[PDB]
Design a protein around this ligand. Sequence first.
Ligand SMILES: CC[C@@H]([NH2+][C@@H](C)CC(=O)NCC[NH3+])c1ccc(Cl)c(Oc2ccccc2)c1F
Ligand SMILES: CC[C@@H]([NH2+][C@@H](C)CC(=O)NCC[NH3+])c1ccc(Cl)c(Oc2ccccc2)c1F
Lengths: 642, 645
Amino acid sequence: GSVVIVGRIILSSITAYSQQTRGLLGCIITSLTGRDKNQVEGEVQVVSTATQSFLATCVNGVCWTVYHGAGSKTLAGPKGPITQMYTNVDQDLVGWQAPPGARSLTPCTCGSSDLYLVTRHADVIPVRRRGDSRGSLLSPRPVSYLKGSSGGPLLCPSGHAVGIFRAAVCTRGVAKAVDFVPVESMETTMRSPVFTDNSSPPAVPQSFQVAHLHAPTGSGKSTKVPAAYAAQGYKVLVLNPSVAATLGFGAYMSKAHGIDPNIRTGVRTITTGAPVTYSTYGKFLADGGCSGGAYDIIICDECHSTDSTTILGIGTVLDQAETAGARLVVLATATPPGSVTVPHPNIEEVALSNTGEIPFYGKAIPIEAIRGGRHLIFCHSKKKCDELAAKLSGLGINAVAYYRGLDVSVIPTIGDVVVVATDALMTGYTGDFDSVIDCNTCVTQTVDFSLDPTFTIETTTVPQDAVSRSQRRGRTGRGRRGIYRFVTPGERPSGMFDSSVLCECYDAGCAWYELTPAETSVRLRAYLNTPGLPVCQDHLEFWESVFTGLTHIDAHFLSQTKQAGDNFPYLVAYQATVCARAQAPPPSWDQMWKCLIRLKPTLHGPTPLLYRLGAVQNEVTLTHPITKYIMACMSADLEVVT
Amino acid sequence: GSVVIVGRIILSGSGSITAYSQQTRGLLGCIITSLTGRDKNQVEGEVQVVSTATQSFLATCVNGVCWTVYHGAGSKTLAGPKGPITQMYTNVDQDLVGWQAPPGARSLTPCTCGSSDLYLVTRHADVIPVRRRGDSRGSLLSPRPVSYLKGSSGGPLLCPSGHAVGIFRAAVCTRGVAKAVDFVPVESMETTMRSPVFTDNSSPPAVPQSFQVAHLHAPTGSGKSTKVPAAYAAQGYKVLVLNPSVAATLGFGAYMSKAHGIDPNIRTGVRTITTGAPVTYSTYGKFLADGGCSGGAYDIIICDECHSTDSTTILGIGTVLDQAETAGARLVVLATATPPGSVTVPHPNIEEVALSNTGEIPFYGKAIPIEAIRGGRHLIFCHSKKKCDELAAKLSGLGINAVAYYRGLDVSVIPTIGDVVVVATDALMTGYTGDFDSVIDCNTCVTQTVDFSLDPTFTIETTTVPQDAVSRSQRRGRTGRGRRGIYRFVTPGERPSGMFDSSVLCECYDAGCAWYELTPAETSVRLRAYLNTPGLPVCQDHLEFWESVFTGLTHIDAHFLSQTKQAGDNFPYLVAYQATVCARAQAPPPSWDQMWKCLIRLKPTLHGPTPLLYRLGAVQNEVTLTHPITKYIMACMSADLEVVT
Ligand SMILES: CC[C@@H]([NH2+][C@@H](C)CC(=O)NCC[NH3+])c1ccc(Cl)c(Oc2ccccc2)c1F
Ligand SMILES: CC[C@@H]([NH2+][C@@H](C)CC(=O)NCC[NH3+])c1ccc(Cl)c(Oc2ccccc2)c1F
């Protein structure tokens, strides 16, 4: 679907009123055709996707809005879908060429500090500017008041535009200030390349640089280019999110480039003396980051990956590499932020229909599509993998489930098979398939600052984004002609990640890498300070403050949550430690709390609840000092998108 | 709009009960089908996935009827092969509606085992074990977060043989965790099917020999509050007529003394009169203030506008129903033009016209042209006091006599008489009795809703929402009275009538404590009688919860409470009680919103965090949760709470 104009905010000796020009049906049809002929009028449009409504503001002949609302979508237009003229993920800013009829606001120059924000309800909220991109509300408002107003203008008294509203800054759910994208970031954006060539690995600079490398897998970004640098005499570390991929580089590089490299993973180390080393991010973090003077070049492969181990790992590289004598960090990926999936010449993509014997996410798979050959079906959950593999086995189709916690030997590697997998596949197993059948959904964790009493870390199912679709689809088509079958053409915006992943970084710092909360922050700051990598909200101080108060964890409980391999081992074992020491029960008896089972006979009363990591079945008390500490941390300024 | 079938859940016909879903329609297909009401797709399966524009849920075919919940479907039609299918059954009381199953659908059939091992089928085609605990209740073997069950109301509960025991309607939650399920029992369905599809309530009942409650569903103008009390009194009975509105109460009395001969007793705050006549007109408020039913005083009590869901009406009606028999009454009449499940139908005297984007006056994303309102007398419903002042101002700039009216302002600012454009909230309807040349309707209203947010306790939120069939009918009713009338509207959307939020129950306890010297237990008796009475508006049974909350709110500061009562805002007791806890701790209120104005004079002595009891608005100050009352209300949140799914 295209983004679709559904109304406009008409400005005036500053007043505002709204007009709605389209209902739900109009909006849906136009989104799908991308053809919109209605008259366009005004500086501020009210726009909508199928999932969301927000604002867009025309400036210098460009219709600007927020990346978090529009992603990389086309805008419905009179001559059809209008491709974005500008996509600046780093600034949460996108732009379309304004169609005829749209009027622009002119940049505010005088440089006033009394500002006015125009909401989707056509209120005019006075704001006092502070920095380049922040303004304090004269009258604090509940945050819900600003939702749907992303993209709306911040105006000076003359009525010229300072920027566009992008996010509220909250204290316990009350918007005290607002974050905006200034008009100078728009101008900068208007002068950036039509297409920057990033497909060429850079030459080694005289002094430290950070370079991007955008190219497909099979391009040789992780094999050909390290070899080339090695031939020139450089030492080079290659970092990858997958244990299986990393191990795979050793036999491949020996055979293909006559280099038997150093290989480093949690489960296996090989030191050959070679000038090229492949390592996982996790093992790099375990080894303590950059070895003094060891490498000239660090290639951060699959740098689009937004698991916490990758984020902290790259952040560590960016904080440590220059000081460690390296000359060149390369952030390499085939799918950078803002990317969209395009047709692949070697992959035929066919939508599932309802015809077929095997039900699948509301559609159907014909048995003939999978009866023989080697096929991969991506499901969002363990449980769905188990049920579908059972169904297929019951029909006598050779089928196996793969997900985190299973050994990869469940395979086979050769012969007919239907592999029914989660995304754990993309790191546990390197092979390709004759076809991929994709549910087009995934599980992700999201933080909710729920104040009940503190925060909640929630597991949710969401539509895949352009990175998930392209990486799932890419398990077919490499050196064979492939087929990609799908439930829905949907595709969320690529390149953004949740604050709960930042929380996981501090968790893993504490649990695995002996990092103090403050050292994790330094490394993440270096990542946050780096354009062209995936984007998140700036919640470093908030999470640092939470983990800073979590002292004297019980070593034993921690070792058990680590061994068990589930998410947030530090927060889980830290809750367990509070419970055990207060002689009180855990929030429930789900397997998350199993390190406490031996104490079940003696644990009683309400749970000293710190935070919510699942269902809370027991009664809760709020009297524990740590709970009070974590509640005070909730008063921190928090960016939240509107 | 029609309900639309967008998928189905297929159940295994052998072995252990399993299921899978099939999606049959996209979003675009769903909206088009809901607009036309014409659904070509053949149906299959017994469990359908259904959707309106605002939500998705399930319906289960049992015995040739496709059943679902009223909280999901309201009174809507079902998109069908030959056009919209009207509901055969609309059982608001049971949260059960039914449409005749169209060709294609199979039906499940009721169980015969009587087994207590049940299986709930969800919209994601999970099959969840449940242990039957009573007629309409089952316990989950594995408690689940409540969000897991949302969108699954209308789903079947199955016995092990795959037959139907009932349909799922609500989760019973404990602090956000579903532990049990509430369902409509299959025997309720069977009874319904063996009973009349149409029942007569169009005429006032004969006075029975012994106590009865009867419904009177009759249009306005049929003289529910004039003709029918008069007719009964003409037979020699004593009649009490209760109405929410002072203005209507006084208007009816005056009308009777002029047109029906009799000078009746009048009972209101502003005007009370004892003539000794056998007809008495009173507000529900004055009735409660007098202490309810005065023994042996009336033979018949007409509870008029009994569709109203303000808390005074509910508490008043509950009182009459708890007390009338004992006080010696023969008949209670529950009278309304718009009973629950009713729908707005066309009216001959009133021409209805969509508002467009053409016109000089912006209005709720559309426009009013000055042509439409420059001559004559018109009424424009706005949702908020704020927008009434900004439209009246924007209208009076263009040489238009525009008077805004809302709660707080006084009637008699409304020209009688002259050319005029009253711009008003729904306060207009309890305040003023006059009609207009036209009505322009924003089709939205402001309501209160409770969220069991546990942050730390509950939140009462003020939200703007689309109007219901009652609000539409009543706003439109201010024109076309015995003459030509025009009704202009921003939107044709009309949400389901006759339901009310748990926040109103809260408000009943608040009002009992604030105004009528009722203990929470006493209020519970009156509300129970209301909840036990079919055909009246419906709500969730949160009575033990709310009674438990107010039971701990003891020793309120009387001065604060007298100030919040006189100020006239909602929840005077909960506001004054938070204010009380604040002052006694010398702590500030949660914010300096007008809500907390009774504390402004103390501003210079109040310091530290607010001992927060609950959320009634934005909380700007730091908070502490150590107050014993906060701890008490937190304990109360452990109550078993029905929440719909
Ligand atoms: C404009 C601010 C920016 N966040 C900064 C912390 C920079 C950053 O993301 N650094 C990471 C390294 N490249 C930002 C940019 C884009 C978006 Cl979409 C932002 O908002 C969200 C919102 C929700 C989830 C993720 C990002 C954003 F804050
Ligand atoms: C089936 C339960 C029923 N509630 C009972 C307390 C009966 C009742 O409402 N009595 C009031 C006087 N007649 C019930 C019926 C219909 C609906 Cl829609 C129910 O659920 C809601 C949900 C949200 C808001 C209002 C009603 C409901 F519980």
